Amino acid sequence: LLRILKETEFKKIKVLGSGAFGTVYKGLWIPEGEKVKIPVAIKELREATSPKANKEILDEAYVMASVDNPHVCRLLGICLTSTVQLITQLMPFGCLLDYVREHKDNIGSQYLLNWCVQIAKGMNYLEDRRLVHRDLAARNVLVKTPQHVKITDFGLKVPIKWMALESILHRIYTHQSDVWSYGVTVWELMTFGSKPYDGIPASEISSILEKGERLPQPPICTIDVYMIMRKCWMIDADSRPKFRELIIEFSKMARDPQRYLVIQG
Numbered sequence: 001l002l003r004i005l006k007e008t009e010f011k012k013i014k015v016l017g018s019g020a021f022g023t024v025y026k027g028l029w030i031p032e033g034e035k036v037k038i039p040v041a042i043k044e045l046r047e048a049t050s051p052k053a054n055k056e057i058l059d060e061a062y063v064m065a066s067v068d069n070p071h072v073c074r075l076l077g078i079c080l081t082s083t084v085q086l087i088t089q090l091m092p093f094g095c096l097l098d099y100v101r102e103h104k105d106n107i108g109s110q111y112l113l114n115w116c117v118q119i120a121k122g123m124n125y126l127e128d129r130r131l132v133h134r135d136l137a138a139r140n141v142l143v144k145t146p147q148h149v150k151i152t153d154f155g156l157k158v159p160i161k162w163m164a165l166e167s168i169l170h171r172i173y174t175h176q177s178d179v180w181s182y183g184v185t186v187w188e189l190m191t192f193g194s195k196p197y198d199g200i201p202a203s204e205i206s207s208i209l210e211k212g213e214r215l216p217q218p219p220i221c222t223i224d225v226y227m228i229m230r231k232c233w234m235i236d237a238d239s240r241p242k243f244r245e246l247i248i249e250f251s252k253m254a255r256d257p258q259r260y261l262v263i264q265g
């Protein structure tokens with residue numbers, strides 16, 4: 001259920017954006033035997049990170065091409081050349097981070113709280129599949145429509161400001177560390193794409209954490225919301241909430257958004 005592509009079957013057409021893992025293109029799939037060309041999204045990765053062999057790269061692709069959840073972006077094809085190219089269904093909206101920045105203060109409670117639930121449902125799917133994301137951030141949550149988001153790049157500098165303490169201290173990555181990152185993601189959303197710890201150098205993040213300081217309460221959040229975010233940042237991984245609890249809690253809040261998020265509008 002993963003299409004291995006030959007450069008002859010597709011073609012990048014325009015650059016749509018660039019980040020750390022690589023560049024995003026609008027592309028076209030040329031089905032052989034036909035006169036049409038089908039739009040696709042191609043993500044060309046920045047290689048040379050630890051020069052891996054292709055069969056070792058495909059082993060992984062096959063797993064990401066195996067996900068089935070409405071809130072998890074699935075790998076559809078892969079083209080292994082000089083560079084590694086990931087193909088998926090093209091969406092018109094790109095990442096949640098930019099989306100929320102573009103709609104800075106004109107986004108409503110219902111939307112925020114729903115993205116929170118959707119992100120948790122996606123994360124809970126991955127947990128059930130025994131997959132650890134490692135870099136869950138709003139930049140990694142794609143928008144299919146403004147009411148339907150999909151998490152991407154599970155298993156792909158170090159996002160210190162998104163990492164749980166143990167990942168920082170020991171490079172320990174678990175579903176519980178994904179919970180931490182999830183709380184940061186929620187925080188980005190609630191602040192409309194603000195940079196976590198604006199100003200503080202990464203080098204100093206372990207110490208402020210250790211000393212018990214946490215990301216500040218977003219002005220739009222009530223204490224119940226902030227309380228949840230904060231629970232995601234406990235030092236003791238096992239005392240952090242589970243994604244299934246998170247789905248439930250946010251589901252409840254989304255049932256009466258205006259009560260849990262205070263936005264002028």
Ligand SMILES: O=C(Cc1ccccc1)Nc1cccc(-c2nc3sccn3c2-c2ccnc(Nc3ccc(N4CCOCC4)cc3)n2)c1
Pocket residue numbers: 016017019024041042043064073074075076086087088089090091092093094095098139142152153154155156
């Ligand atoms: O194969 C997989 C699964 C996976 C799971 C586990 C491990 C590895 C891979 N994932 C994947 C594949 C291909 C691209 C990507 C991607 N990575 C990113 S970051 C942002 C957007 N994407 C996409 C993206 C994707 C599709 N379609 C669009 N469409 C689209 C529409 C507007 C824009 N714009 C940018 C400028 O302003 C807004 C308009 C930009 C793009 N994007 C992800």
